């Protein structure tokens, strides 16, 4: 008896978990690489997008949207996806 792959008695397909909206999910990107100079901060890399969660000062709470890490981050290091030149 020759070899072969799996093969169930039925088949189906649909789109995957593709996202929506943006109005209340501040996607920023890191302008530069950062490595928590002082306590309670995220360490991110240049071109890490992050979902900002609080924005009330020069430092913002965010989550690395590539890796689901969280922390405060420097707003000078960073920039809204909606505000890029690309």
């Amino acid at each position: 008896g020759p070899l072969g792959s799996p093969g169930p008695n039925s088949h189906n397909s649909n789109t995957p978990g593709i996202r929506e909206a943006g109005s209340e999910d501040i996607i920023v990107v890191a302008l530069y690489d950062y490595e928590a100079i002082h306590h309670e901060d995220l360490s991110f890399q240049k071109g890490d997008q992050m979902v900002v969660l609080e924005e009330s000062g020069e430092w913002w709470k965010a989550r690395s949207l590539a890796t689901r890490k969280e922390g405060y981050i420097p707003s000078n290091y960073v920039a809204r996806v909606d505000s890029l030149e690309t």
Partner: peptide, 12 residues
């Protein structure tokens, strides 16, 4: 927060 007067930006 405003814990520090921002980090020192890179060499660019």
């Amino acid at each position: 927060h405003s814990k520090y007067p921002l980090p020192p930006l890179p060499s660019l």
